[PDB]
Design a protein around this ligand. Sequence first.
Ligand code: HEM
Length: 150
Amino acid sequence: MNSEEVNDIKRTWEVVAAKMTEAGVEMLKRYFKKYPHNLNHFPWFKEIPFDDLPENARFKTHGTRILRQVDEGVKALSVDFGDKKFDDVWKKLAQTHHEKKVERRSYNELKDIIIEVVCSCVKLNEKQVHAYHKFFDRAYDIAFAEMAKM
Ligand code: HEM
């Protein structure tokens, strides 16, 4: 991970961090619309008609919480992911998510969406899209290595 790539992820991410709840709702409703199978992991959310979800309290709150943990990841991001504080964030995900058997594919599908919603807030170029993928790849690689114990 570059020095220009780290700074690009920080500069652009601030724009999304300014409106966490509005971005989180957008993120979750694209995600469940485009990948409806992932609804099975959230029993409480299928119990509700789809067009009613955006305006549901547990649903806005949960969107925000996903992005606020991502926020911490971006803050501890250094060149070549050199700062152990980065591993911290995603070891914390490991111990929160290990209890469900959510498989790798499901996390990849969410990355697709998160990365798309950032695009709709700020215009990324190819190099910045590329760097956002390496970010989440690395976060996911850390999380799963830690879940491999259990
Ligand atoms: C970017 C990757 C992800 C991050 C940063 C993230 C973050 C979080 C956070 C912050 C919580 C809240 C825990 C609490 O309230 O104490 C949570 C819970 C949860 N996560 Fe994720 N998550 C990610 C990916 C996923 C994926 C892909 C799934 C499966 C579709 C998933 C399933 C769940 C479920 C079912 C809960 C419990 C919801 C609840 O009880 O309200 N997570 N996660």
